[PDB]
Coordinates of N, CA and C and ligand atoms in Angstrom, one line a residue:
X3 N 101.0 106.3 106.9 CA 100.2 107.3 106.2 C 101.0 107.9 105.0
X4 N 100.4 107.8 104.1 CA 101.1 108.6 102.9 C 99.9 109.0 102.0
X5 N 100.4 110.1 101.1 CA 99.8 110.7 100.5 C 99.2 111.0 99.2
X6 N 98.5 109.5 99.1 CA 98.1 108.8 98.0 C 96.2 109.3 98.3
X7 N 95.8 109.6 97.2 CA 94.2 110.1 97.4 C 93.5 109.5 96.6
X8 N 92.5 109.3 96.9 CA 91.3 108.9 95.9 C 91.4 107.0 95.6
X9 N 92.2 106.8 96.5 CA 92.3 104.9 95.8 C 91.6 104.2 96.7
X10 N 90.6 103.8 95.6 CA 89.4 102.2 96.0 C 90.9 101.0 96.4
X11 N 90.7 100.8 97.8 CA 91.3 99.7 98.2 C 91.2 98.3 97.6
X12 N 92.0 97.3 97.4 CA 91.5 95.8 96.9 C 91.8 95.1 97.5
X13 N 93.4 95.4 98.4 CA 93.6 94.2 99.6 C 94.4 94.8 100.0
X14 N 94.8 94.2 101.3 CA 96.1 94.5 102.5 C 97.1 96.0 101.6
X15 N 97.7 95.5 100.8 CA 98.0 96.0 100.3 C 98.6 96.8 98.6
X16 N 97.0 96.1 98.2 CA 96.7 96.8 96.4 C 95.7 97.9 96.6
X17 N 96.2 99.1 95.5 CA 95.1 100.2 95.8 C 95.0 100.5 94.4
X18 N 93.9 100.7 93.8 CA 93.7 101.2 92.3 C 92.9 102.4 92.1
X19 N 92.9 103.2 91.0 CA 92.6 104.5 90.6 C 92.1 104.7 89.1
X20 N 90.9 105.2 88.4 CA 91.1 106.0 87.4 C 92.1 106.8 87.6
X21 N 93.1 106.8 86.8 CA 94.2 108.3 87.1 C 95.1 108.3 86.0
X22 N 95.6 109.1 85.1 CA 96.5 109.3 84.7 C 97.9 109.3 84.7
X23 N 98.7 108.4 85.1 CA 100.0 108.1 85.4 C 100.9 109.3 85.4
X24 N 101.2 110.0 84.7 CA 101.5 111.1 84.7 C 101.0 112.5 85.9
X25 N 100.0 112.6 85.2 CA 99.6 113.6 86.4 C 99.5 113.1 87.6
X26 N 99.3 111.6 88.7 CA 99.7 111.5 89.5 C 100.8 112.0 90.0
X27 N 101.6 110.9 89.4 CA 103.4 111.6 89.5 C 103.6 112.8 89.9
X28 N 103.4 113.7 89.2 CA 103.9 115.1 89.6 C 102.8 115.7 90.5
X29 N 101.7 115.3 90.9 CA 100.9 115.7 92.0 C 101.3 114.8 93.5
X30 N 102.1 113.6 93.3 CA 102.5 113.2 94.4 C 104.2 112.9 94.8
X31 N 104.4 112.6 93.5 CA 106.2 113.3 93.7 C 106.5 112.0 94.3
X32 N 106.1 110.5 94.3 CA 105.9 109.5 94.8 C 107.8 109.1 94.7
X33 N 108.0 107.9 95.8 CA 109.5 107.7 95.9 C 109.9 107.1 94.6
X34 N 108.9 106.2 94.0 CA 109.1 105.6 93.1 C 107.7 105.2 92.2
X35 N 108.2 105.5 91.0 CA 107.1 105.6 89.9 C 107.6 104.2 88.7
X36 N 106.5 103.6 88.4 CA 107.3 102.4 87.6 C 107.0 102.9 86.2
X37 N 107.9 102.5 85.7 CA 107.3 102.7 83.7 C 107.5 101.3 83.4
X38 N 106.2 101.3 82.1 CA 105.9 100.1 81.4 C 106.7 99.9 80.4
X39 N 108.4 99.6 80.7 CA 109.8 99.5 79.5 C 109.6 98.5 79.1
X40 N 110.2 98.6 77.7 CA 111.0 98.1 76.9 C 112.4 97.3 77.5
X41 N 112.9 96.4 76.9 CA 114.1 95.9 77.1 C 115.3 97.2 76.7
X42 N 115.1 97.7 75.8 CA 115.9 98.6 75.3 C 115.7 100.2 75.7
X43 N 114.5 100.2 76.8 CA 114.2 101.4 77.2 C 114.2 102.3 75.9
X44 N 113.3 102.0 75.1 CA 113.3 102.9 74.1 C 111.7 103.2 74.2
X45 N 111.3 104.8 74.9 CA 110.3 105.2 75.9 C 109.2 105.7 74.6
X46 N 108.6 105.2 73.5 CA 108.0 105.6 72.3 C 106.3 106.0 72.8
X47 N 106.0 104.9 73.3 CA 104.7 105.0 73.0 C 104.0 104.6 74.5
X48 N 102.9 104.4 74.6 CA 102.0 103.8 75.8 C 102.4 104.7 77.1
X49 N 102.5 104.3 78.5 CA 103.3 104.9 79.2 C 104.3 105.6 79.0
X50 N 105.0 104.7 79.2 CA 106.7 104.8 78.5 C 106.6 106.3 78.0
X51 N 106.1 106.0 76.8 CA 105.9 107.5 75.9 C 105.4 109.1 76.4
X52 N 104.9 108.5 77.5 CA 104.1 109.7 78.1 C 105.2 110.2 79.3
X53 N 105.1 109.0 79.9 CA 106.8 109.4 81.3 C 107.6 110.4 80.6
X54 N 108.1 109.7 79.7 CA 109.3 110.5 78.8 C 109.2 111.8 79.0
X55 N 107.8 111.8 77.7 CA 107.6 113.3 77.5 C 107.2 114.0 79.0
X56 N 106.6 114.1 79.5 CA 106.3 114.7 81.1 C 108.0 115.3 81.4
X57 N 109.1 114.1 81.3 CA 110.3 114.6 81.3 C 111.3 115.5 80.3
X58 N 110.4 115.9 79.3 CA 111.2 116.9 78.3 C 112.4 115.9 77.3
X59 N 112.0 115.0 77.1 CA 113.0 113.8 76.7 C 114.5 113.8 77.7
X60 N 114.4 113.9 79.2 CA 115.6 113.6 79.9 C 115.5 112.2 80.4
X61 N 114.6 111.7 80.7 CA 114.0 110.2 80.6 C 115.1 109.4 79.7
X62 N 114.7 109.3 78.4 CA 115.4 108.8 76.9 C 116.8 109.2 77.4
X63 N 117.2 110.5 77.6 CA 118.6 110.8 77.3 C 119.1 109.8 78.5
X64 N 118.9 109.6 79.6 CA 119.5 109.1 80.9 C 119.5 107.7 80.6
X65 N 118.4 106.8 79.4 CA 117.8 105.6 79.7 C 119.2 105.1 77.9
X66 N 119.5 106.1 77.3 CA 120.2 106.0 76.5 C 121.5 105.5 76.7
X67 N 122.3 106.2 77.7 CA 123.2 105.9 78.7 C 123.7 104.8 79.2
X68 N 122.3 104.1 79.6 CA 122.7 103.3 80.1 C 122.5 101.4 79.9
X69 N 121.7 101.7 78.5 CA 121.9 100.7 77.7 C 123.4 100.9 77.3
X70 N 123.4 102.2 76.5 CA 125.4 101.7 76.2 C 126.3 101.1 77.1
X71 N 126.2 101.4 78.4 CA 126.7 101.2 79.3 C 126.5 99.8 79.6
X72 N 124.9 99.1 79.8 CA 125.0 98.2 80.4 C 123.9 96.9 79.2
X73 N 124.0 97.7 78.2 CA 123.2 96.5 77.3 C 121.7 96.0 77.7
X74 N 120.9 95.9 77.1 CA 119.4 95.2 77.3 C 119.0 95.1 78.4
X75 N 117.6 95.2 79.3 CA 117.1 94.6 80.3 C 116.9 93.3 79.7
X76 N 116.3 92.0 80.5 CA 115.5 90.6 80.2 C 114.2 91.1 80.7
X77 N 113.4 90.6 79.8 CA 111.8 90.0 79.9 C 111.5 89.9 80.9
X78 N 110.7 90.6 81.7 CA 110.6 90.4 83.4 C 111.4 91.4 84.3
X79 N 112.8 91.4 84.0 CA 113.6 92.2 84.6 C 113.1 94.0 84.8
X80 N 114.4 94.5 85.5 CA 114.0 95.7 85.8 C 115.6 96.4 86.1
X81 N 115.4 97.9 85.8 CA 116.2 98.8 86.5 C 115.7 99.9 87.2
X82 N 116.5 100.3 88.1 CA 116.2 101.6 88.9 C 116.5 103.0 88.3
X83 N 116.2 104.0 87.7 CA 116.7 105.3 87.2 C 116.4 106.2 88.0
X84 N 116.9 107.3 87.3 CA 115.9 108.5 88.4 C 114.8 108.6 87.6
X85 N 113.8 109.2 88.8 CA 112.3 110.1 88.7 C 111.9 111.0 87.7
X86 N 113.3 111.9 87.5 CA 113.6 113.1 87.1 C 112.5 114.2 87.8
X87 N 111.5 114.9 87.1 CA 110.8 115.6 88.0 C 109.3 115.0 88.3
X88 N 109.2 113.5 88.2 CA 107.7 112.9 88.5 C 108.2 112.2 89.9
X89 N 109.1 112.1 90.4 CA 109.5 110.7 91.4 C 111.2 111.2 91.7
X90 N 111.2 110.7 92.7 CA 112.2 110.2 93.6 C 113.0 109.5 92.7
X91 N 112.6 108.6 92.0 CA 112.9 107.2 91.1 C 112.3 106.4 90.2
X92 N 112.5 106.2 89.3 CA 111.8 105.1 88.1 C 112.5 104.2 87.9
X93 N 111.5 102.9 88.5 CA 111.7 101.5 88.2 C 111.3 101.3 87.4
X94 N 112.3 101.2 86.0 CA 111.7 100.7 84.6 C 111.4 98.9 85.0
X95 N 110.2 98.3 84.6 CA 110.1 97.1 84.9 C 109.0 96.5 83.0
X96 N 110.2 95.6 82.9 CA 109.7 94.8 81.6 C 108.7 93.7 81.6
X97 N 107.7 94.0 81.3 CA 107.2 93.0 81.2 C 106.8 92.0 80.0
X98 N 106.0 91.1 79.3 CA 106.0 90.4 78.3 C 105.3 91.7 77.4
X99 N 105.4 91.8 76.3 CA 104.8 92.0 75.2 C 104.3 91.0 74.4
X100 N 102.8 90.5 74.4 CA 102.0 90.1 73.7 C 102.2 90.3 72.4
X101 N 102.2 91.2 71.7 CA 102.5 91.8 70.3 C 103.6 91.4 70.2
X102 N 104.2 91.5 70.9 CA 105.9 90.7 70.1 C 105.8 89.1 70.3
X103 N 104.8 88.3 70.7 CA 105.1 86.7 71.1 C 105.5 86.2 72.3
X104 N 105.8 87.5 73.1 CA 106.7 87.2 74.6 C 105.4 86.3 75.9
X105 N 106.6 85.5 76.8 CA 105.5 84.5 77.7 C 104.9 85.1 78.7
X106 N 104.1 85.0 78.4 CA 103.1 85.6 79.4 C 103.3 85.1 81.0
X107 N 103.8 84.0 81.3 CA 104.4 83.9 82.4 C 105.3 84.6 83.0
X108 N 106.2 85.5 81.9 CA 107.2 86.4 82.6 C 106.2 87.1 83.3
X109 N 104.8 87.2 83.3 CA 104.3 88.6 84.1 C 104.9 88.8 85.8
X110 N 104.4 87.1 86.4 CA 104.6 87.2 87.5 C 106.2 87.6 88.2
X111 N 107.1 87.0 87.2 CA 108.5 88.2 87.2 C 108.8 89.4 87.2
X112 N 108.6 90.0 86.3 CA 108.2 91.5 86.5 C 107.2 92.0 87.5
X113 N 106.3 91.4 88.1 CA 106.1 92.1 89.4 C 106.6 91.7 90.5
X114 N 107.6 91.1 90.4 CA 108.3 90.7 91.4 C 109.4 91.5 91.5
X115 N 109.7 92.4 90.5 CA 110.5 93.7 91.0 C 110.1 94.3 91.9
X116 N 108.4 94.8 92.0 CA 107.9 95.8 93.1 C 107.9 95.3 94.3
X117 N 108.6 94.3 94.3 CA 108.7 93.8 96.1 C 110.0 94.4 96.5
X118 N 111.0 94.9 95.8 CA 112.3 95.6 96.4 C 111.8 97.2 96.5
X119 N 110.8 97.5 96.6 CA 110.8 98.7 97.0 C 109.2 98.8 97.9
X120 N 109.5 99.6 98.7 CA 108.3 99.8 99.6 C 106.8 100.1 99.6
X121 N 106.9 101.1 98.7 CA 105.5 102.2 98.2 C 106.2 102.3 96.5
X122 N 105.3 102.5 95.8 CA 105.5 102.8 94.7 C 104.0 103.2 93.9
X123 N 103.9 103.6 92.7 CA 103.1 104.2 92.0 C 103.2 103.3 90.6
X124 N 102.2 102.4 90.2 CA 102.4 102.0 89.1 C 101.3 101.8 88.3
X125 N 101.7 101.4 86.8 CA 100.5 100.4 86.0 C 100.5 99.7 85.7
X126 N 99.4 99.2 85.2 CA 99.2 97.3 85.2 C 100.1 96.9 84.2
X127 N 101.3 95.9 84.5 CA 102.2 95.6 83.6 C 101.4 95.0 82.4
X128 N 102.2 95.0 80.9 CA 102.0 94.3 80.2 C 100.3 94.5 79.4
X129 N 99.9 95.6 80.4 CA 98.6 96.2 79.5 C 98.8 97.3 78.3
X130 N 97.8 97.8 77.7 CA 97.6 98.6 76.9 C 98.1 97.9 75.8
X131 N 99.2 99.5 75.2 CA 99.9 98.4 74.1 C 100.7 97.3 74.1
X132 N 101.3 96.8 74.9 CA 101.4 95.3 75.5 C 100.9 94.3 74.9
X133 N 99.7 94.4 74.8 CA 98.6 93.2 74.6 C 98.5 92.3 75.5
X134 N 98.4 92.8 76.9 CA 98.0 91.5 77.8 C 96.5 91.6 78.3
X135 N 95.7 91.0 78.8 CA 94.2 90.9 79.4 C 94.5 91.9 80.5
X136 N 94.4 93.0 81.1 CA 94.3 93.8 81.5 C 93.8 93.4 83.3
X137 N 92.8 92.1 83.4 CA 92.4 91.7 84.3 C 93.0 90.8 84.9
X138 N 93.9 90.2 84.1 CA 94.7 89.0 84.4 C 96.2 89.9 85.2
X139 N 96.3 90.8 84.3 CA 97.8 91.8 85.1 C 97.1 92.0 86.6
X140 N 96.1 92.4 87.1 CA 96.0 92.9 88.2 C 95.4 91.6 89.0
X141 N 95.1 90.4 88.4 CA 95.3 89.1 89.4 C 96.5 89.1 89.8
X142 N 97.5 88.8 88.9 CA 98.9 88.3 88.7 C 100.0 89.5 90.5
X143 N 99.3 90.8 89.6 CA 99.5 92.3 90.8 C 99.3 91.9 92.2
X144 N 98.3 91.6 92.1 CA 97.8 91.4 93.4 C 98.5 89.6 94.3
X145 N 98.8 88.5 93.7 CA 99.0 87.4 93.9 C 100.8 87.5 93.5
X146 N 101.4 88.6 93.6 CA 102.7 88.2 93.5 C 103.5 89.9 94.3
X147 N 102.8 90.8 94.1 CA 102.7 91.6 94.8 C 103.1 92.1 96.4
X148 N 103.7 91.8 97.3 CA 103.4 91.9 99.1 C 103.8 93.4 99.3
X149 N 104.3 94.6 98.9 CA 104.6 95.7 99.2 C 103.6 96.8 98.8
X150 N 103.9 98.2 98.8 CA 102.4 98.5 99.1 C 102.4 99.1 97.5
X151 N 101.2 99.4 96.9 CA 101.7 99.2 94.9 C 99.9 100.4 95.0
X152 N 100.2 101.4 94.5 CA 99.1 101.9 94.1 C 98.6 102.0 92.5
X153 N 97.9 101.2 92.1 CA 97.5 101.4 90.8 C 96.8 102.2 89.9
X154 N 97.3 102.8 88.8 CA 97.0 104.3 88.1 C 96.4 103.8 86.7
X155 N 95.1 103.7 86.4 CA 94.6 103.1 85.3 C 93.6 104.1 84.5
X156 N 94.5 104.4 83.5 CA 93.9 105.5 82.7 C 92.8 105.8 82.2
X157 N 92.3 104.6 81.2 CA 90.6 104.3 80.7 C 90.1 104.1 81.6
X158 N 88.9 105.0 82.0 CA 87.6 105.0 83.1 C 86.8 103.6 82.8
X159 N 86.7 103.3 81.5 CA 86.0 102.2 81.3 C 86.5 101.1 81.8
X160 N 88.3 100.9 81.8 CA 89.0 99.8 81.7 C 88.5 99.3 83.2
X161 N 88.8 100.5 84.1 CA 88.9 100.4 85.6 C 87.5 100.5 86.3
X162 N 86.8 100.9 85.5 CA 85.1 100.1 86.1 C 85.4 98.4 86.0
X163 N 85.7 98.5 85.1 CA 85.5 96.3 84.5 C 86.6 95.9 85.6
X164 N 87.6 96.4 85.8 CA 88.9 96.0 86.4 C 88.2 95.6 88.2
X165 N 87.4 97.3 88.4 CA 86.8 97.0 90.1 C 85.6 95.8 90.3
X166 N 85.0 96.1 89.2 CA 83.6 95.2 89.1 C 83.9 93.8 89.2
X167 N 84.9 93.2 88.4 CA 84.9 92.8 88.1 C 86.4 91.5 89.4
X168 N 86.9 92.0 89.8 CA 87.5 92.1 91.2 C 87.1 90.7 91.7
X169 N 87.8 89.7 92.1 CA 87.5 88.8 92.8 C 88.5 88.7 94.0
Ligands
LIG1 C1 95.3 102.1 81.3 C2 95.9 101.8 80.0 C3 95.5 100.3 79.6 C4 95.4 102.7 78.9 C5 97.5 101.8 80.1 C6 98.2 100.9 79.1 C7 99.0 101.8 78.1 C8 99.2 103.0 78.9 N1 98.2 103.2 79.9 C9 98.3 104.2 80.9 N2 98.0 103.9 82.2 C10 98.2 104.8 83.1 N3 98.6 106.1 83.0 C11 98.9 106.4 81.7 N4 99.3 107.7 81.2 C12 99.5 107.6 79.8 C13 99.1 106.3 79.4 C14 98.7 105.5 80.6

């Protein structure tokens, strides 16, 4: 039991939501919250941009760090940061950017980071400004997926088509 509310079930273990990613977070304080990064963790816009700010820009300052330190994520790839005050933890996880030309096959790599962690709070990789099919991320979610992943999908509209639309 844990203390996730309001999520229409999809399988064993995918659960989805109209919700705001943000205000989740700091209403569940989850162990781990994923953001939709950049290779360069440079947190501007979409999620990313919103995490950040929720964090008062200590997100950026921490994520700044540790590119100097440790240079680029890869396409698909992932790191662990802290939460700061949304989570326990942020699994920055990269996935393709459509807009930039990136393969859309990295998707099923990038969700294959949320298998090293147990419960987590996330969004559909590679959507919004991304540019991926929004419906295709939460097949990909669900079929690469085995740990327990609650889904937080902001547009009411997106996530009607997303349930309806559900196979
Ligand atoms: C559902 C959308 C397709 C709109 C995705 C893609 C881009 C960001 N977005 C978000 N998702 C969940 N929580 C969020 N909080 C702020 C933004 C945001």
């Amino acid at each position: 039991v844990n203390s996730f509310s309001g999520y229409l079930k999809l399988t064993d273990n995918v659960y989805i939501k109209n919700a705001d990613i943000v205000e989740e977070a700091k209403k569940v304080k989850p162990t781990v919250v994923v953001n939709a990064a950049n290779v360069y963790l440079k947190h501007g816009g979409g999620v990313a941009g919103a995490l950040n700010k929720a964090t008062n820009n200590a997100m950026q300052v921490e994520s700044d760090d540790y590119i100097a330190t440790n240079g680029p994520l890869k396409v698909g790839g992932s790191c662990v940061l802290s939460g700061h005050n949304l989570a326990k933890h942020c699994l920055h996880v990269v996935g393709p950017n459509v807009n930039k030309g990136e393969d859309i096959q990295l998707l099923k790599s990038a969700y294959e980071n949320f298998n090293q962690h147990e419960v987590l709070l996330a969004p559909l990789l590679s959507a919004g400004i991304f540019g991926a099919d929004p419906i295709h991320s939460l097949r990909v979610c669900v079929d690469t997926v085995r740990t327990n992943v609650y889904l937080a999908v902001f547009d009411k509209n997106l996530y009607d088509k997303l349930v309806s639309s559900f196979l």
